[PDB]
Amino acid sequence: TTRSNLYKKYNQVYDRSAQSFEHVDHYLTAESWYRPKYILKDGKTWTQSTEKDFRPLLMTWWPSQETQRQYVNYMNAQLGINKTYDDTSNQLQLNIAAATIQAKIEAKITTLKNTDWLRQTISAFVKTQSAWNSDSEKPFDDHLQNGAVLYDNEGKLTPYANSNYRILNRTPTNQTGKKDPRYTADNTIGGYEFLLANDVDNSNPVVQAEQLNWLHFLMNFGNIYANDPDANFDSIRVDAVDNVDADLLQIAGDYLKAAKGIHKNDKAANDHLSILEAWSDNDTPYLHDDGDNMINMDNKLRLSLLFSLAKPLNQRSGMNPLITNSLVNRTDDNAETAAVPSYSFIRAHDSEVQDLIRDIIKAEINPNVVGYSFTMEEIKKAFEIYNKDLLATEKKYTHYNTALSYALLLTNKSSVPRVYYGDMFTDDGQYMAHKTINYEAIETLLKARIKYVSGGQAMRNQQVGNSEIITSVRYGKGALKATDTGDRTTRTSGVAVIEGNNPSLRLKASDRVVVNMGAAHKNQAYRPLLLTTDNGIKAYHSDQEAAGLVRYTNDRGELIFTAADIKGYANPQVSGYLGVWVPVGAAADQDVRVAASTAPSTDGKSVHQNAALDSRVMFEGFSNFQAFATKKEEYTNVVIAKNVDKFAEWGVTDFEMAPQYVSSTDGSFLDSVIQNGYAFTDRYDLGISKPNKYGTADDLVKAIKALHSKGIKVMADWVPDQMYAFPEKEVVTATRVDKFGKPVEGSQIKSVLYVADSKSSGKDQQAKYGGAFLEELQAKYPELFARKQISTGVPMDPSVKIKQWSAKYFNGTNILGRGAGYVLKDQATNTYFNI
Ligand SMILES: O=C1/C(=C/c2cc(O)c(O)cc2O)Oc2ccccc21
Ligand SMILES: [Ca+2]
């Protein structure tokens, strides 16, 4: 190695052994240190080196002479030697320069009695060279982190990182490696493999088995961790469906059927109600054909709410999409069971939050911010602007008409509404510490939903005066149709929502809005629940609070409104109009919800959008931008246990907790900066080795038990796409690719060695729990392991347990800024060093 170009015989490597080199899989890197036969204690005395006397390889060796010059110029400037060397410069001059630097390095080592300062200096120097930084990884692509590398299936130099799999972009749309001819709403292959960080190979049968193992662990967390059967997760969210092999959907579906019997009846299904985050318009019909074993979002209704109500006044659509642009056309929804089950929302922890922070940062701080890779300080200043925009009548960045969106989400038939934490409480600050201006209106709607919201739905779109309004009516419990005359409970249930999306709305003196309440509501007293005022929304918490504002239906069951009742407003809460009316005389404890039956299911689907699923409410119970806890009583899971009576009062039946995995701290993405739980190194570390952002493993256990004590189900966020920040390095044969895994031609990284962080400790929760339940699962549920998965043609393979993650179980990684030449070669032979 160390050539006849220095003080050899002194600076040569101690022995031909591997305990003398800092190596990665027996290869050397530009940041590799080594143990020389002799060190030079200060610039003074050559002494025999100990086992603790490692020194930078770059102190005494260089890949080319060009690099030695670069090293001398750099290390002179660092150590206070204003001598520069230029284009012309013999080997003898630079070897003399290299000695001198060597001598002063050793002097500073003895002065400070550490090498920490030199680790940094060598690192900083290495990152100045194109072959050891981003410049050899360019050009960047639309990957969230600027690009990715794909690990080669057959690398002769790295056979330990080989795979017979790494089958990419097997989305629901593209599961067979061809576009599914059945699903035509999305032209595209319906997603892409490389999203973030280390991309897990969910096409590998051994990894599939391990994803099921993790699923079983989460669904038995209570039993396994705390020997407590009251502290298990009831259900899952499947994170990033469009970025993983869709085989995982048959695996998770089969498990819910085999383990929880969700296929038998609605009681079983509704005790384990599991959701997808699946953005392709193909994913809902895919999931329906697969057996409604889980439910997807209604993306169409989300876009209809966003563009009809939430957008600025000049970017706002007409209101008719609120009726027609959804999985369910709500003109006249009179069905006992909707065709397809779904959940509905206007915002989520990611959707229409991090997007708005990015808009603010890009507009008023850093125009060159990459994807969602924000700094904490960018976030804090963005939130100064955001929090002011929330309280403004004229909003530049934040949603208009939040209460109008929730009035529709919480009265609509044939979808499970999901309330976002950050619409009731502030997106920043401590958990449940600060209420939004919309908290009252949303709370009032949640309590009214339990008491009044049942039966058939009618929505109408009336052109009035200069613009338009919509009416949305529920007929009341037992009344699917406008002609049903109902019983006593029908009479005191039902609701009328009236909305406009234009602040200039003025009815003519001649205009009337006739709202059919249904044949159970003839000649009846009605009172307001919400009314738009000049400064916001007045909530009425009882019949008596509203005593002065009572109005009546006529003999046909119609409420009638005029200009006196309806006009456009502009205030911090309403841009248009909102009016919500309920019948007078509901008992204090009236509850028109319905439980799931044990009657056998007969249509081949697990989940059914009937009155019992319509009775459920989902709560997404975190924000990305929650402040870190300063003391135990501010930990979210401790606050959840303390406030569990609130959630029951609101009719929350399904509590979607944040992912509970201990966050990585690399800061390479938003998730790793605000530590939400989506960026992790250990899949089984649920606040066990260290608190998560939300508290300790014991705080989580107590939160689950508290929710269960009120009959509320708890959802585990299943995140099989990627992992962050592995502590051990590994050398892989890699190819630069776009997020679809297509090779970027004109790249130095092409069947080339590259140094990834892709090995786990072997001493973490993964090492304890990995594969630990595969024998139990194959014994109880052999059919799970008999199924030939669609993408691979073969069953899951539980014959190997994953105690340590390594490169062979991953597709690739986001580019790490280590360059195409980071692994060192002998210049003459043009081959890599191997020990
Ligand atoms: O491509 C889409 C996307 C990205 C998306 C993907 C993710 O896995 C994620 O964690 C967050 C995202 O927002 O958001 C959309 C919304 C509507 C239609 C298409 C897209
Ligand atoms: Ca992936």
The string of DSSP codes covering 752-789 is EEEEEEEE--SSSHHHHHTTTTHHHHHHH-HHHHHS--
Our answer on whether the CB atom of 279 is closer than 6 Å to any ligand 1 atom is yes
- Give the environment of ion ligand 2: residues with CB less than 5 A: 193, 199, 243, 721
Distance 725 CA to ligand 2 centre (A): 16
Q: What does the block give as tokens for 282?
A: 């193909």
| Cα-based angle 648, 649, 655 (whole degrees, multiple of 5) | 35
Tell me which H or E stretch contains 55: strand 55-56
The protein residue with its alpha carbon nearest to ligand 1, atom 2, reads: 279
Distance 248 CA to ligand 1 centre (A): 19
Report phi then psi at 260, rounded to 5. -115, 0
455: alpha, beta or left? (left if phi > 0; alpha if psi -120 to 50)? left
Kindly provide the b/e burial profile for residues 701-723, where b requires at least 16 CB atoms within 10 angstroms of the residue's own CB. bbbbbbbbeeebbbbbbbbbbbb
Residue 718 · residue 238 · CB < 8 Å: yes
d(CA 682, CA 75): 39
List, as one string, the DSSP characters of 602-645: -SS-S---SHHHHT--EEE---TTBPPPSSGGGSHHHHHHHTHH
d(CA 422, CA 354): 12
Residue 517 · residue 561 · CB < 8 Å: no
Our answer on whether the CB atom of 281 is closer than 6 Å to any ligand 1 atom is no
The protein residue with its alpha carbon nearest to ligand 1, atom 11, reads: 350
Residue 796: inside a domain: no
The helices-and-strands tally (H runs, E runs) of the chain is: 24, 31
Our answer on whether the CB atom of 676 is closer than 6 Å to any ligand 1 atom is no
Report phi then psi at 320, rounded to 5. -55, -35
Q: What does the block give as tokens for 640?
A: 């959840």
Residue 327 · residue 355 · CB < 8 Å: no
Nearest ligand to residue 191 Cα: 1
Distance 208 CA to ligand 2 centre (A): 13
Pairing of strands 575-583, 296-297: unpaired
d(CA 584, CA 18): 84
Our answer on whether the CB atom of 195 is closer than 6 Å to any ligand 1 atom is yes
d(CA 16, CA 1): 10
Our answer on whether the CB atom of 596 is closer than 6 Å to any ligand 1 atom is no
Resolution value, angstrom units: 2.3
Distance 346 CA to ligand 1 centre (A): 14
Distance 620 CA to ligand 1 centre (A): 18
The protein residue with its alpha carbon nearest to ligand 1, atom 18, reads: 279
Q: How far is CA 206 from the centre of its chain?
A: 24
Q: From the alpha carbon of 242, which atom of ligand 1 is closest?
A: 8
Residue 25: inside a domain: no
Q: From the alpha carbon of 195, which atom of ligand 1 is closest?
A: 8
Kindly provide the b/e burial profile for residues 756-791, where b requires at least 16 CB atoms within 10 angstroms of the residue's own CB. bbbbbeeebbbbebbbebbeebbeebeebbeeebbb
Maximum CA extent, the chain: 109
Our answer on whether the CB atom of 389 is closer than 6 Å to any ligand 1 atom is no
Distance 142 CA to ligand 1 centre (A): 13
Kindly provide the b/e burial profile for residues 528-543, where b requires at least 16 CB atoms within 10 angstroms of the residue's own CB. bbbbbeeebbbbbeee
Nearest ligand to residue 244 Cα: 2
The protein residue with its alpha carbon nearest to ligand 1, atom 16, reads: 279
**Burial tier of 726 (Cβ tally within 10 Å: 0-12, 13-18, 19+):** buried
Report phi then psi at 795, rounded to 5. -70, 160
d(CA 713, CA 706): 11
Residue 561, CB-side half-sphere exposure with 13 Å CA sphere = 27
Residue 654: inside a domain: no
Nearest ligand to residue 192 Cα: 2
d(CA 11, CA 53): 12
The protein residue with its alpha carbon nearest to ligand 1, atom 17, reads: 279
The protein residue with its alpha carbon nearest to ligand 1, atom 1, reads: 279
Quick one: the chain helix, strand, coil %, rounded to 5?
30, 20, 50
Distance 574 CA to ligand 1 centre (A): 28
The protein residue with its alpha carbon nearest to ligand 1, atom 7, reads: 240
Domain that holds residue 56: 33-132
Q: How far is CA 40 from the centre of its chain?
A: 53
Coil, strand, or helix at residue 248? Answer: helix
**Burial tier of 389 (Cβ tally within 10 Å: 0-12, 13-18, 19+):** middle
Nearest ligand to residue 248 Cα: 2
Residue 697 · residue 687 · CB < 8 Å: yes
Domain count, the chain: 1
Q: Report the sign of the C-alpha dihedral through residues 784, 785, 786, 791, in that order.
A: positive
Residue 237: inside a domain: no
The protein residue with its alpha carbon nearest to ligand 1, atom 15, reads: 279
Rounded alpha-carbon distances, angstroms, from residue 606 to 237, 251, 326, 628 = 16, 15, 22, 39
The protein residue with its alpha carbon nearest to ligand 1, atom 3, reads: 279
The protein residue with its alpha carbon nearest to ligand 1, atom 8, reads: 240
The protein residue with its alpha carbon nearest to ligand 1, atom 19, reads: 279
CA proximity to 25, closest of 826, 823, 829, 825 = 823
Whose structure tokens read 């056979």?
A: 159
Q: What does the block give as tokens for 125?
A: 């120097």
Our answer on whether the CB atom of 228 is closer than 6 Å to any ligand 1 atom is no
d(CA 737, CA 137): 10
**Burial tier of 597 (Cβ tally within 10 Å: 0-12, 13-18, 19+):** middle
Residue 59: inside a domain: yes
Nearest ligand to residue 246 Cα: 2
Kindly provide the b/e burial profile for residues 638-668, where b requires at least 16 CB atoms within 10 angstroms of the residue's own CB. bbbbeebeebbebbbbbbbbbbbbbbbeebb
Nearest ligand to residue 811 Cα: 2
Distance 740 CA to ligand 1 centre (A): 15
Residue 113: inside a domain: yes
DSSP designation for 167: -
Q: From the alpha carbon of 299, which atom of ligand 1 is closest?
A: 17
Our answer on whether the CB atom of 29 is closer than 6 Å to any ligand 1 atom is no
Residue 727: inside a domain: no
Experimental method: X-ray
Our answer on whether the CB atom of 243 is closer than 6 Å to any ligand 1 atom is yes
**Burial tier of 141 (Cβ tally within 10 Å: 0-12, 13-18, 19+):** middle
CA proximity to 22, closest of 36, 10, 43, 9 = 36
Q: Report the sign of the C-alpha dihedral through residues 131, 132, 133, 137, in that order.
A: positive
Distance 360 CA to ligand 2 centre (A): 29
Our answer on whether the CB atom of 171 is closer than 6 Å to any ligand 1 atom is no
Residue 612 · residue 266 · CB < 8 Å: yes
Residue 652 · residue 712 · CB < 8 Å: yes
The protein residue with its alpha carbon nearest to ligand 1, atom 9, reads: 240
Residue 831: inside a domain: no
Nearest ligand to residue 277 Cα: 1
Residue 622 · residue 350 · CB < 8 Å: no
Our answer on whether the CB atom of 350 is closer than 6 Å to any ligand 1 atom is yes
Distance 278 CA to ligand 1 centre (A): 8
Nearest ligand to residue 669 Cα: 1
Distance 279 CA to ligand 1 centre (A): 6
